[PDB]
C-alpha cells in the first residue's frame, strides 16, 4: 500500500497548508476508485488516498471501474470498465441484490445510484449496470478487516492505518478469523518466494531451494536470511516445502516476514477478557500475561546499520587501525588486528566498533598536561581519536561487516579511502510502554505485565492472555471487535450444528461444510458479506467441549472466570474470546530520551534537538504562559537563562552542583545579544 497510493501534493499539485476543505471530502464519484476509509490521520486527510481493489487506469490517466451490464432486467456477464464521466449517464444497481438464477431481480424495485450521487429506489427495468462485487469501494488494506460494517468510519480508518505499522514477529501465526484478502495480498506484494514453473522439489535448505522442472533444467531459489529492511525490521525468509514435494506454477514455496503458509499474518491470536481489572487497563491501556514473554509470542528482531568512512584530509589520511590514542587495553578486547569488531561480539552503549584515528597536526598543551606527560612518561600522540562507537541506548550482537576499499577497486566517492558498515542485531521482547493494537482501530500501550499466577483463569485453569477494557467499547462504536471475539472462540473450539432432524432456521442460508468444523479451524468473513448477527448466536450455542465434557462459554458468549489474585470467582460472567492483535512499531526503546548536558548549536548557543543528537525538550511559548500564570518567576528564569543561553552561567552551575555550593544568579542570555547585533546591522541605534 505504499504503491497504489494516490497523493495530491507534490510538484505541480496543491500544497498542504494552501488546501481547502473541498478537496479533502469524499466526492460521490469516489465509489470504486478511491477508498473513503483509508487515508492518513494527521494534516493530510483527503490529500493522500489509495486505489480500490478492482480499479484500473485509463490511457489518458482517468480511473476505471468494472460493472456488469444488465439487459431487460437480466444481469449478463459482459464486464464494462466505466470512467467517472459516463458512470453518471447511466444508472448503477447494488451488488447485494437478489438475482434469481438467470439474471432477473427477485423484487421488482432495486436500490440504485443516480447521476448526481442520489440514492433512489427504481423499478427493475431502467437498471443497466450492477457492481461486480461488494467491497468494491474499499482498498486493499481496508478489505482485511473482519466485520467492517459494524465499525464507525473513524475507527475503521485507524484500523486500516494501524495494519501497515505492525512489526514482523519471529513466529508469525496466521489469523483465526479473517477476510478473503489475506492470501492475495501476500503473493502479489512480492515478499513471498513463488515457484515459477511446475516442478518437483529436489533439494531444500534454509538458504536455497533447487526444484527440478518437468522439461530438463533445474532452478535454484535463494532465500534472503536476516536482511535489514528500510525501517530496521527483519526480512527472514524460510521454506515450507520438503525434499520430495510436487509443486505447481504459482504455488507459494517460501514464507516471508509476516506470512504463514502463504497468507498474511501480522499478529497473533490471544485469549482476551473484556473485564476492567483493578485499574491497570484504565483509559485505553492494555495489560498482558507473562506467558508472552516466556514463550516469545511477541518477540521481534531489529537490525541497525552503522557506517564510517576513512577519507583523505588536508593534513594526511585517516587510518582505520587498532592503534588508538590514549585508551585502556580492556576496551580493545573485541576489535581484531585491522580495526573493526568481530562477528558475534556483543556490544553495548559506548563500545568501539571501528577503530579510526585522524591526524591532528598541531596544538600546544596546557602546562599541567605537559607536566602530567613528563611524570608518567607518555608521548603527545598528535593524531586525534574519532572512532565509531554505538549511540546511546543501543546494544546487541553483530551480524555482518561490509567493507569497501579503494585498494580493491570498489566504487566509492572522491577522497574516500575506506567505507565500512556494521550491522547490529537485537532481539526485542515485549515490554510495558510498547504499543499493541487490534484490527478494529482499538489500540493502547501495555501498562502492566502480570505474572501467570495472578491473572483471571477459566474453569480449566487456563489463564487469559490480554485483558481489554469495557469502557472503550461502546463510546467508540467499533463493536466489531466484540464479534470477532465471539467467532474467534468458535473457530478455536469448533462447532457442530446438529441437523439430525433438520437444518435449523438460523443455518438455512449458511453454506455446507460450515455445519461442523474441527478445532483451530480458520474461517473467513468477507467485508460486506460475512457472518450475520443471527449466525454468531447460533454457532455460540454449539461450541464443542475441550478435553472433558465441559462447555466453557455459554450462549451469551461470556464465561465464569476465577480470580488469580484472591481466589474466589468474579460475581458475574465475563466475555472471553480470541482476538487477533498486532505489535506496532512504536516501541519504548526508540522513544525514551534523557539529557543532562550535550551538544549546543552554532549561532545561538541553545541546545540541539532530537534523539539522533542529544537535544533538549523544547520549553516553548505555551509552557512559558503556564509558568507565568502559576507565578513561578524563578523556575522560568532558570529554564530560560542558565539552561539555554547564559554561556558563563552554564559551566558555573555545573561547577556549583559538583562542588556542592549554591546555584549562582543568572546573567544575560546570549541569544538576546545576537538580537542587538541583528538590529544594529539594520541601521537602528538600539542602545
Amino acid at each position: 500500500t505504499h504503491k497504489r497510493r494516490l497523493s495530491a501534493l507534490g510538484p505541480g499539485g496543491l500544497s498542504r497548508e494552501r488546501a481547502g476543505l473541498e478537496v479533502r471530502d469524499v466526492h460521490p464519484s469516489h465509489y470504486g476508485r478511491m477508498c473513503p476509509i483509508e487515508t492518513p490521520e494527521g494534516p493530510n486527510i483527503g490529500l493522500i488516498g489509495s486505489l480500490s481493489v478492482y480499479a484500473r487506469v485509463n490511457p489518458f490517466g482517468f480511473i476505471e471501474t468494472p460493472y456488469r451490464k444488465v439487459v431487460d432486467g437480466v444481469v449478463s456477464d459482459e464486464i464494462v470498465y466505466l470512467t467517472a464521466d459516463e458512470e453518471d449517464r447511466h444508472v448503477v444497481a447494488q451488488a447485494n441484490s437478489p438475482i434469481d438464477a438467470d439474471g432477473r431481480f427477485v423484487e421488482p424495485r432495486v436500490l440504485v445510484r443516480r447521476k448526481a450521487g442520489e440514492v433512489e429506489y427504481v423499478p427493475s427495468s431502467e437498471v443497466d449496470y450492477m457492481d461486480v462485487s461488494p467491497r468494491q469501494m474499499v482498498s486493499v488494506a481496508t478489505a482485511m478487516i473482519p466485520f467492517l460494517e459494524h465499525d464507525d468510519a473513524n475507527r475503521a480508518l485507524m484500523g486500516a492505518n494501524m495494519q501497515r505499522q505492525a512489526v514482523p514477529l519471529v513466529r508469525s501465526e496466521a489469523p483465526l478469523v479473517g477476510t478473503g484478502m489475506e492470501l492475495r495480498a501476500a503473493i502479489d506484494a512480492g515478499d513471498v518466494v513463488v515457484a515459477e514453473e511446475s516442478g518437483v522439489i529436489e533439494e531444500v535448505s534454509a538458504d536455497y531451494i533447487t526444484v527440478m522442472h518437468d522439461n530438463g533444467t533445474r532452478r535454484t531459489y535463494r532465500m534472503r536470511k536476516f536482511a535489514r529492511s528500510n525501517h530496521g525490521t527483519c526480512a527472514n525468509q524460510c521454506p515450507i516445502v520438503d525434499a520430495g514435494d510436487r509443486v505447481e506454477a504459482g504455488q507459494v514455496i517460501a514464507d516471508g516476514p509476516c506470512t504463514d503458509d502463504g497468507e498474511m499474518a501480522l499478529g497473533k491470536n490471544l485469549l482476551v477478557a473484556i473485564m476492567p481489572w483493578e485499574g491497570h487497563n484504565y483509559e485505553d491501556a492494555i495489560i498482558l500475561s507473562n506467558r508472552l514473554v516466556e514463550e516469545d509470542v511477541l518477540t521481534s528482531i531489529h537490525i541497525e546499520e552503522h557506517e564510517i568512512d576513512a577519507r583523505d584530509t588536508k593534513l594526511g589520511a585517516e587510518e582505520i587501525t587498532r592503534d588508538i590514542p590514549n585508551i585502556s587495553d580492556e576496551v580493545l578486547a573485541d576489535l581484531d588486528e585491522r580495526g573493526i569488531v568481530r562477528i558475534g561480539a556483543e556490544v553495548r552503549d559506548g563500545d568501539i566498533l571501528v577503530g579510526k584515528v585522524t591526524p591532528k597536526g598541531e596544538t600546544e598543551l596546557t602546562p599541567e598536561e605537559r607536566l602530567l606527560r613528563a611524570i608518567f612518561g607518555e608521548k603527545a600522540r598528535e593524531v586525534r581519536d574519532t572512532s565509531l562507537k554505538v549511540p546511546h541506548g543501543e546494544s546487541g550482537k553483530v551480524i555482518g561487516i561490509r567493507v569497501f576499499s579503494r585498494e580493491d577497486e570498489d566504487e566509492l566517492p572522491a577522497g574516500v579511502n575506506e567505507l565500512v558498515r556494521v550491522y547490529v542485531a537485537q532481539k526485542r521482547k515485549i515490554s510495558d510502554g510498547d504499543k499493541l493494537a487490534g484490527r478494529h482501530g482499538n489500540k493502547g500501550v501495555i501498562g502492566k505485565i502480570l505474572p501467570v499466577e495472578d491473572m483471571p483463569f477459566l474453569a480449566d485453569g487456563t489463564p487469559v492472555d490480554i485483558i481489554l477494557n469495557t469502557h472503550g467499547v461502546p463510546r467508540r462504536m467499533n463493536i466489531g471487535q466484540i464479534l470477532e471475539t465471539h467467532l474467534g472462540w468458535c473457530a478455536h473450539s469448533g462447532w457442530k450444528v446438529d441437523a439430525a432432524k433438520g437444518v435449523p432456521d438460523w443455518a438455512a442460508r449458511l453454506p455446507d461444510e460450515l455445519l461442523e468444523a474441527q478445532p483451530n479451524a480458520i474461517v473467513s468473513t468477507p467485508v460486506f458479506d460475512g457472518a450475520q448477527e443471527a449466525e454468531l448466536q447460533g454457532l455460540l450455542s454449539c461450541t464443542l467441549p475441550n478435553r472433558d465434557g465441559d462447555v466453557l462459554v455459554d450462549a451469551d458468549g461470556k464465561a465464569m472466570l476465577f480470580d488469580g489474585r484472591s481466589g474466589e470467582p468474579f460475581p458475574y460472567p465475563v466475555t472471553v474470546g480470541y482476538m487477533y492483535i498486532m505489535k506496532l512499531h512504536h516501541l519504548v526503546d526508540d522513544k525514551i530520551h534523557a539529557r543532562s548536558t550535550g551538544p549546543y548549536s552554532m549561532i545561538t548557543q541553545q541546545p540541539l534537538g532530537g534523539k539522533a543528537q542529544f537535544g533538549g525538550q523544547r520549553f516553548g511559548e505555551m509552557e512559558c504562559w503556564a509558568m507565568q500564570a502559576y507565578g513561578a518567576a524563578y523556575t522560568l528564569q532558570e529554564l530560560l537563562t542558565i539552561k539555554s543561553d547564559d554561556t558563563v552561567g552554564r559551566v558555573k552551575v555545573y561547577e556549583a552542583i559538583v562542588k556542592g555550593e549554591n546555584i549562582p544568579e543568572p546573567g544575560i542570555p546570549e541569544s538576546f545579544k545576537v538580537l542587538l547585533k541583528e538590529l544594529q546591522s539594520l541601521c537602528l541605534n538600539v542602545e
Partner: peptide, 27 residues
C-alpha cells in the same frame, strides 16, 4: 480459490463474484 497450494479457509460468503481480484501491482 484458484491458487494451488492455498490453505483451506472456509468462507461465510453468501454471494459469488464474476470477476476475480486483478494483478494488484498493475497500476
Amino acid at each position: 480459490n484458484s491458487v494451488p497450494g492455498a490453505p483451506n479457509r472456509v468462507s461465510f460468503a453468501k454471494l459469488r463474484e464474476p470477476l476475480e481480484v486483478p494483478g494488484l501491482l498493475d497500476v
